[PDB]
Design a protein around this ligand. Structure first.
Ligand SMILES: O=C(O)C1=C[C@@H](O)[C@@H](O)[C@H](O)C1
Length: 158
């Protein structure tokens, strides 16, 4: 019963996460960051050098490991974390809901997947991911306004 942020790259998870940890004085984890740093490659180079399924295995395992932590944390999560059957039960999740249009400018990158530098593939991924964010959301948050306006809605779910 972590506070888990989800949704697509550039919807503002890590920044919300660093703000929520501060406001709530909880520790903040970032799954992409933890993997990149255990592996010693950017997430880009993980994809390039090691392939998506191996990244996806590093995500599956980290989810389980995060589940064993005692104290609640604020966790931001990579774009595809929802691909994982084992997210459910990590924590209370908050979907940072964005439209593709707003999203674009901000998702110019590093932890960015090579497919996310193809915009039509990006849009197709985005579309296919909508249903997965919704299915894995404890709460859905209109992320279109600022960091504050997302913060507002988060906190009311306590
Ligand atoms: O949406 C995804 O599958 C990606 C999102 C990023 O947060 C990084 O997890 C990684 O680039 C892959």
């Amino acid at each position: 019963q972590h506070l888990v942020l989800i949704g697509f790259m550039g919807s503002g998870k890590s920044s919300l996460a660093q703000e929520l940890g501060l406001a709530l004085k909880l520790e903040v984890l970032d799954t992409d960051m933890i993997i990149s740093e255990r592996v010693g490659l950017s997430v880009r180079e993980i994809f390039e050098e090691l392939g998506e399924d191996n990244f996806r295995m590093f995500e599956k395992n980290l989810i389980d490991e995060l589940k064993t932590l005692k104290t609640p944390h604020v966790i931001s999560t990579g774009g595809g974390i929802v691909m994982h059957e084992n997210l459910k039960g990590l924590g209370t999740t908050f979907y940072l809901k964005m439209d593709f249009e707003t999203l674009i400018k901000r998702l110019n990158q590093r932890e960015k997947r090579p497919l996310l530098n193809n915009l039509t593939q990006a849009k197709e991924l985005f579309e296919k991911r909508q249903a997965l964010y919704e299915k894995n959301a404890s709460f859905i948050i209109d992320a279109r306004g600022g960091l504050n306006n997302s913060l507002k809605q988060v906190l009311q779910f306590i």
